[PDB]
Design a protein around this ligand. Sequence first.
Ligand SMILES: CCCCCCCC/C=C/CCCCCCCC(=O)OC[C@H](O)CO
Ligand SMILES: CCCCCCCC/C=C/CCCCCCCC(=O)OC[C@H](O)CO
Ligand SMILES: CCCCCCCC/C=C/CCCCCCCC(=O)OC[C@H](O)CO
Ligand SMILES: CCCCCCCC/C=C/CCCCCCCC(=O)OC[C@H](O)CO
Ligand SMILES: CCCCCCCC/C=C/CCCCCCCC(=O)OC[C@H](O)CO
Ligand SMILES: CCCCCCCC/C=C/CCCCCCCC(=O)OC[C@H](O)CO
Ligand SMILES: CCCCCCCC/C=C/CCCCCCCC(=O)OC[C@H](O)CO
Ligand SMILES: CCCCCCCC/C=C\CCCCCCCC(=O)OC[C@H](O)CO
Ligand SMILES: CCCCCCCC/C=C\CCCCCCCC(=O)OC[C@H](O)CO
Ligand SMILES: CCCCCCCC/C=C\CCCCCCCC(=O)OC[C@H](O)CO
Ligand SMILES: CCCCCCCC/C=C\CCCCCCCC(=O)OC[C@H](O)CO
Ligand SMILES: CCCCCCCC/C=C\CCCCCCCC(=O)OC[C@H](O)CO
Ligand SMILES: CCCCCCCC/C=C\CCCCCCCC(=O)OC[C@H](O)CO
Ligand SMILES: *C/C=C(C)/C=C/C=C(C)/C=C/C1=C(C)CCCC1(C)C
Ligand SMILES: *C/C=C(C)/C=C/C=C(C)/C=C/C1=C(C)CCCC1(C)C
Ligand SMILES: *C/C=C(C)/C=C/C=C(C)/C=C/C1=C(C)CCCC1(C)C
Ligand SMILES: *C/C=C(C)/C=C/C=C(C)/C=C/C1=C(C)CCCC1(C)C
Ligand SMILES: *C/C=C(C)/C=C/C=C(C)/C=C/C1=C(C)CCCC1(C)C
Ligand SMILES: *C/C=C(C)/C=C/C=C(C)/C=C/C1=C(C)CCCC1(C)C
Lengths: 255, 252, 255, 252, 255, 252
Amino acid sequence: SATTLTLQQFSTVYNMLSFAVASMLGAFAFFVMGRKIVGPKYRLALVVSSLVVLIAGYHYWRIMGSWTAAYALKDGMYVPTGEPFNDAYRYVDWLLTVPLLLTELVLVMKLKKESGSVLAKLILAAIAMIALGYPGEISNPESQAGARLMWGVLSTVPFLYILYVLWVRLGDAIGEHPAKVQVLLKNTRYLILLTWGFYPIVYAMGSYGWLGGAGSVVAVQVGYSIADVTAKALYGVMIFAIAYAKSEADGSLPA
Amino acid sequence: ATTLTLQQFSTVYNMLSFAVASMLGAFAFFVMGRKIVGPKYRLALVVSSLVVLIAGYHYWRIMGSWTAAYALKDGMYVPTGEPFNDAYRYVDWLLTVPLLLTELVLVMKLKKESGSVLAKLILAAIAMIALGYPGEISNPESQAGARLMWGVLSTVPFLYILYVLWVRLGDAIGEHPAKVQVLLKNTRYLILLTWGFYPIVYAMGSYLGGAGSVVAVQVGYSIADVTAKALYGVMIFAIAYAKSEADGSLPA
Amino acid sequence: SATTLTLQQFSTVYNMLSFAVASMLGAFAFFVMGRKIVGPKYRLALVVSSLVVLIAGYHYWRIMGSWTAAYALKDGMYVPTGEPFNDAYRYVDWLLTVPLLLTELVLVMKLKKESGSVLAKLILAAIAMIALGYPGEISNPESQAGARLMWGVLSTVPFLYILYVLWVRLGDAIGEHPAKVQVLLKNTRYLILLTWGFYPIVYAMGSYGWLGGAGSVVAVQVGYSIADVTAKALYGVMIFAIAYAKSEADGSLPA
Amino acid sequence: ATTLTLQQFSTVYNMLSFAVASMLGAFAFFVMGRKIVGPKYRLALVVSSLVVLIAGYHYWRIMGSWTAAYALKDGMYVPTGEPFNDAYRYVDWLLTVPLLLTELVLVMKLKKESGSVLAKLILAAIAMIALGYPGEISNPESQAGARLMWGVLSTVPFLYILYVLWVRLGDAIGEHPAKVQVLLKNTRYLILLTWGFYPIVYAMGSYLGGAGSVVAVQVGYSIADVTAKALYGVMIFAIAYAKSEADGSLPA
Amino acid sequence: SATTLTLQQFSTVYNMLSFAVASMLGAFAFFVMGRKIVGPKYRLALVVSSLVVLIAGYHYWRIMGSWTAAYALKDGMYVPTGEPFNDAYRYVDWLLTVPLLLTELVLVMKLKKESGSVLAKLILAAIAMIALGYPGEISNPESQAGARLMWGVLSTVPFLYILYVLWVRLGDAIGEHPAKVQVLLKNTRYLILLTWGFYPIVYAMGSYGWLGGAGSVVAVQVGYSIADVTAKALYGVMIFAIAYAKSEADGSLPA
Amino acid sequence: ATTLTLQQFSTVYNMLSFAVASMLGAFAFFVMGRKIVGPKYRLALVVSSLVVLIAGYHYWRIMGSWTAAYALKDGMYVPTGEPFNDAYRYVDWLLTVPLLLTELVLVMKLKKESGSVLAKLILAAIAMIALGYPGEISNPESQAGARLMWGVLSTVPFLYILYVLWVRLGDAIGEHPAKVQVLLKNTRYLILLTWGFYPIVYAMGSYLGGAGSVVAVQVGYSIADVTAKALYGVMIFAIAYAKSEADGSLPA
Ligand SMILES: CCCCCCCC/C=C/CCCCCCCC(=O)OC[C@H](O)CO
Ligand SMILES: CCCCCCCC/C=C/CCCCCCCC(=O)OC[C@H](O)CO
Ligand SMILES: CCCCCCCC/C=C/CCCCCCCC(=O)OC[C@H](O)CO
Ligand SMILES: CCCCCCCC/C=C/CCCCCCCC(=O)OC[C@H](O)CO
Ligand SMILES: CCCCCCCC/C=C/CCCCCCCC(=O)OC[C@H](O)CO
Ligand SMILES: CCCCCCCC/C=C/CCCCCCCC(=O)OC[C@H](O)CO
Ligand SMILES: CCCCCCCC/C=C/CCCCCCCC(=O)OC[C@H](O)CO
Ligand SMILES: CCCCCCCC/C=C\CCCCCCCC(=O)OC[C@H](O)CO
Ligand SMILES: CCCCCCCC/C=C\CCCCCCCC(=O)OC[C@H](O)CO
Ligand SMILES: CCCCCCCC/C=C\CCCCCCCC(=O)OC[C@H](O)CO
Ligand SMILES: CCCCCCCC/C=C\CCCCCCCC(=O)OC[C@H](O)CO
Ligand SMILES: CCCCCCCC/C=C\CCCCCCCC(=O)OC[C@H](O)CO
Ligand SMILES: CCCCCCCC/C=C\CCCCCCCC(=O)OC[C@H](O)CO
Ligand SMILES: *C/C=C(C)/C=C/C=C(C)/C=C/C1=C(C)CCCC1(C)C
Ligand SMILES: *C/C=C(C)/C=C/C=C(C)/C=C/C1=C(C)CCCC1(C)C
Ligand SMILES: *C/C=C(C)/C=C/C=C(C)/C=C/C1=C(C)CCCC1(C)C
Ligand SMILES: *C/C=C(C)/C=C/C=C(C)/C=C/C1=C(C)CCCC1(C)C
Ligand SMILES: *C/C=C(C)/C=C/C=C(C)/C=C/C1=C(C)CCCC1(C)C
Ligand SMILES: *C/C=C(C)/C=C/C=C(C)/C=C/C1=C(C)CCCC1(C)C
């Protein structure tokens, strides 16, 4: 089965899940309302921003239900119920939202005829990343260690491709914009860099650790919440700030 | 009925949760994207919003029916006696497929014959779904003859719909700007790929596999619905955005 | 009591009821949104169109609850619960919506001073039709065959009156409009003609058939759904198309 | 209490479902009809929307109370011990009747005395409902004296309200266009027919019949509420539309 | 414990609570919609009017739940359940809404530089009134009669202060406005005078009466509903009427 | 755990119901007050609406948790075994405190450094709440050392936030009209009074009292949240209204 949890551990994970739910839905309303403030050519990017956090809001709402249904209160403790709580529900979120995360960045940036081509490759790359990752995630890290490693390696190839394209296609376009736009674009890269590495690490953790003890279960689940809120809601605020800065630069800010 | 492995139940549940999320995301897009395109293409986005709203609620219900048809016992998911209503999609299609045809006609240029053309497609789609329904609920083992016959009878209006869409979309490519032309070409390919997937899943259910067959049919129908409705609506929006940039009606 | 049903039969009726619910509510949103597109003198007719489908949406929502509450799952079967499922709940729908169906047609057509008089007679006719039909519907087709026939006959008199008025007041006004308006008005008559005959036939069926077997129960209930969706939602789309055509003819289409 | 036949329970339930549907339909009409009339008559339609919205929810509750007060046993509907709160309409009237008077005053031309006139009618309507409430909950058999007395005391502000409405509506007929005049004449007749129906139903409940009496009172009150609120609001809208076409403020 | 109630007594209190709920929420929608009709300098007062009735709507919704949960149906009777129904939940309503009631009156009236000072004193007075009243309300009228009286007396001091300020600050400003504004301002004072005295009387009743019998329980609870609807919803209508009259006087009525 | 008197349970429940009502009232104010101030200050009111909306729902949940953690027995409220999640506020603060800082920055004049300043405050607020959380769930009796340490570590970013707000608000007083200046002065005092209250309640929970301690912490946190969010948002609105009257953008 799984691990027994204290009220403190169960509450901590439940609260970080409720933190995630509130952050995604609140950011949704913010991005919906923020459309009126930026230039008209950057409003489609904010719509996609709202879409990302809306979907992750729905998915975290289900995860929160899944978490409370996998444990039951007995003798001042939370003991498993047999109902499964898995990380593979997250992939259903990622498969849709990660291609959308790339889309909103490209839409807020300048289109250079090939912008469609650059986006299409990244979307296809992100899809294959999650798609190849899924067989490895549902594989038993012990009884199926060969399959887990193979899919992880195959999944990492389009992953580094996305990271490479973002580094090379952003710096060549960072150095063409005002100082405020550069800082916003620069930090957005760091934001992607710091946060997106969490998911493969936890995948590699299950292969070489994690599940060992309740604290590991809490930490990983707390980590997913922090990573998702920053990679989706905070990331969407950066897209909004880039839209306002670029709208302020080309003179399209509503007056 | 049959017992499922933990993986099979999880997989079908996830594809159902994927479908719910895709519709919810597509709904918000079409509602908000209405403001971004020209004023004469917004009714097409209104119909797009309804299609995904209806299918979203219906997939929300399908997910409830799925989780209620199995129970976890001994590391397995065994049936509960509560039935899984697989015919619930066909009543959705009976409403949403006629609506999908409408949004394509509305996003295109209105002609004199547009009224007659739409009604014929809807009558075909109705007869298609109507003939398919006896075949869908037929037992693939004890009632294999009826499944094929209704499958065969249903494809006649099916191929009729595909022919009309191919011919009425190619005739409009050569009158529009290049960007509008590319979108219409890809839209034809998209309709063919997605609408052709459903006959395969019907033939998948017919032929035995066991639980893998159950997973495939539910996964296949779910993917088909998501691509034929939400991905399809994005093309309707993209056609609306291109035509709005061409006729100078883009709100920007 | 009543009949026992298979899962297939119960599901079929349940699905056609859910089809009806979705069609009525979806058409409501369509007609509400479609007001902006037609001329201002035809928008009141679309409001009445929305009202018809909204009411039928509410009534079919209750019918769906009534259907699931009249049967219970036992041994892979649906056996009655004793709770009644009757066609007389439909008359409460018809008594309000049928007068409204006539109203929206007259409002989309040209007012000719007497338009109030024509409408008032039809509304009074439709009311008496449903009102006279109700005593006959709740009468036992066997133990009370005299009362059933008498009310059916009395109900058919204002029915044919409505049909006569529609045929004579529409053709005299069809031949005064453009070709597209004529086709729309012509098909609307056929739509009324084909669909409205279903209700008396089922009334006459209960007198001389139906209730015999489960298949009859399914067919009649499936028929009501098909008839209601076409006589209310498809009919409202025809009213919308007439409004757009007439708005396009008199030059009032919003530009 | 008393047992009801299947027909009696069904009839009262249907008239309650008729009332719910009528209010829901009337609500959407007044909300949407606000946009169609002139800008100075829209607050009257706002109040119209509230009246039917409040009464719709209340009739939704009355229906729940009705179905919860009886149970199906032996081809009969026998009481459950759960009570049916027939006084729930009077607390509705205490709110909605003062609102109904307001929407009539708002749709008419505002004068200096309009403020005083409205307050007097509301005070009368309050006292009318207030005196009627002791009489409504009084037992028609063991407490027949109190029922009549409260009925008698309640009609004094009742006839006061009817007199004022007759006199303030006839004085405004002769200053308006012909179409506005006809509407005001019919509005007076409508108020008299509908407001007079309630005293009959109170006298119906007093005098015994048994279950037929129970059906009549509930059917009568339901019909009276539907005609005095939703049908009444359509006249308020019709007066608004006529005055908007007369003063040139029709949004068209 | 408490008293046993008949179905009639329980229904009466339940209905007057549902009357209060409907009146507060309905007035909320009225004040929200009524903003468009008055001058722009009086619209903030109507927002505060909506706030008062919205809060009292929420609080009466809870009181209605509290009432149904304090009694249970047994043998055609309503007997207590042990769950408490107290008047001290009302103070949580009053502590917020009474300062708001004064605010909306001052905002609809003319600001005379010191209007902030006058309002601040009244708000501080109203707060201390409810604050001093609370220790006395939760005191046992019999075992704690010294504390009940003392807090009641201390609570009455800012109460009469508010009444004095309203009488003196309104008449000096009534006699500066048109006749219609004077009548509206004059009746608003009478409205405050008649209704606001109910609360101390019921406080003094618990000290020297009430709780004796079920009829007293019904009357007091019925009284609170009548008092709250007139002191909040009817009072807000008077504020709306003053705003429309003053907007009509200074020529700011939307045309 | 500990049993509570009827008064203690009622008091904490009332302060929770007070908090719910205050947030609901504040939400409607900020939504409606958006229309009343100038167009460039409305995003700050949008964020104000979210803060109170989030905290309103969370206090609605806290009230449910509170009533579910005790049961009435023998004229007492005794624990039920169902736990009261007191850490649920800290996850609220983790979202709402960063939002509260934002609305202040948005209502003020935007400068070049405004971007950097906000991010530092949010990082501080995050670390503040993050370090406070281990201390909040620590047992005041068996784990008194950890409570103090996390309390001590949490105040470092706390005093950092207070210093920045004092210095960036005094620098903006002397560039604005007198009415704007007074509001900014009082806003500083308000932030200090309310933000300083939380450390006291943490020290209250640490030091024993018993149930009175439980009441104080819950009452203190509730009052602190209501004044630091709803009362704070009214000042944000008042600053918005004053600046709108100064720059001539008041919708009137
Ligand atoms: C709905 C329940 C029944 C289900 C069965 C399928 C119903 C299909 C209905 C299609 C409505 C299409 C009406 C189109 C009327 C013309 C509108 C139009 O041409 O507008 C173009 C543009 O918006 C001008 O600017
Ligand atoms: C077993 C019984 C089976 C019964 C099966 C019945 C099916 C009826 C559906 C017909 C399709 C009608 C589509 C209607 C679309 C009309 C659109 C229209 O008329 O608008 C054109 C005009 O140009 C705008 O101005
Ligand atoms: C509501 C809870 C208590 C129930 C007790 C009954 C309350 C009756 C209230 C009536 C409000 C009427 C206020 C009318 C104020 C004048 C508005 C007006 O004259 O506006 C006309 C027109 O809209 C300008 O263009
Ligand atoms: C047992 C205790 C029973 C107590 C019973 C108390 C009843 C109080 C209701 C009075 C009616 C008040 C109606 C208020 C309508 C005012 C409308 C108004 O003042 O507006 C006019 C002005 O012209 C706009 O500008
Ligand atoms: C939200 C979930 C994560 C929680 C972590 C805290 C997030 C803090 C986000 C702040 C958004 C601020 C974006 C501001 C972008 C600039 C907008 C602006 O300057 O607009 C001014 C004015 O409206 C022009 O007229
Ligand atoms: C245990 C792990 C702990 C991890 C902790 C991670 C915390 C990340 C939060 C950083 C604050 C970011 C605030 C972002 C505010 C940005 C606002 C902005 O960029 O807008 C300025 C520009 O002027 C508009 O045009
Ligand atoms: C894990 C948490 C990590 C910390 C997350 C919150 C801090 C984010 C601060 C962003 C300031 C961005 C502008 C910084 C300007 C000074 C620093 C700098 O050197 O920026 C060079 C750039 O060219 C401009 O001048
Ligand atoms: C500033 C831009 C973003 C900056 C980069 C953000 C990246 C976030 C990713 C992973 C953090 C995971 C942290 C996991 C910390 C868990 C803390 C915890 O509570 O674990 C203790 C456990 O509960 C004992 O039982
Ligand atoms: C404009 C709207 C027009 C809508 C037009 C809809 C036409 C019929 C569609 C679906 C019927 C679905 C039920 C089909 C049943 C097939 C018979 C069958 O064998 O299955 C069920 C039966 O009860 C054995 O148990
Ligand atoms: C185009 C304009 C409208 C055209 C005219 C539309 C009129 C619809 C009225 C009645 C149809 C009733 C059809 C009933 C078919 C029932 C099919 C069925 O499924 O019954 C099999 C049963 O389930 C085995 O057990
Ligand atoms: C502006 C708002 C003003 C509103 C003004 C409302 C005035 C009173 C109305 C209804 C009271 C209903 C209860 C009446 C009770 C009558 C006494 C009675 O005998 O019945 C109940 C009693 O508990 C025996 O059980
Ligand atoms: C016009 C401006 C406002 C005018 C002033 C309004 C002040 C309302 C305050 C208190 C009234 C309390 C009245 C309580 C009446 C209770 C009637 C009742 O029903 O009690 C009988 C009991 O139920 C038998 O068992
Ligand atoms: C932009 C968004 C950035 C958000 C950044 C959030 C950073 C961490 C915040 C809260 C963690 C709350 C849990 C802290 C747990 C402390 C460890 C502990 O001892 O308690 C739990 C443990 O499971 C013993 O049972
Ligand atoms: C909002 C959610 C986001 C940004 C999720 C991102 C997920 C990844 C970048 C996952 C990467 C993986 C690999 C590189 C290999 C192992 C499998 C994955 C899917 C965890
Ligand atoms: C949104 C749903 C859509 C677009 C559904 C489309 C469905 C089809 C094209 C179905 C076709 C079928 C046949 C050709 C025969 C077998 C039965 C069907 C209904 C699966
Ligand atoms: C939306 C619902 C509609 C259009 C319903 C129409 C119903 C009828 C035309 C019913 C007619 C009847 C008779 C002519 C006699 C027998 C009784 C009736 C009510 C079934
Ligand atoms: C929407 C509800 C309305 C218009 C209700 C009106 C009610 C009456 C006019 C009631 C009158 C009564 C009497 C004259 C005496 C007997 C008791 C009443 C309350 C039924
Ligand atoms: C909407 C609610 C209102 C206007 C409540 C008003 C309450 C009072 C004026 C209460 C006054 C009290 C005293 C003067 C002393 C005794 C205690 C009080 C709180 C009942
Ligand atoms: C809306 C909620 C707000 C503004 C919360 C503010 C909270 C604090 C300023 C908390 C400070 C703390 C310390 C300084 C140390 C002890 C732990 C805390 C979190 C209570």
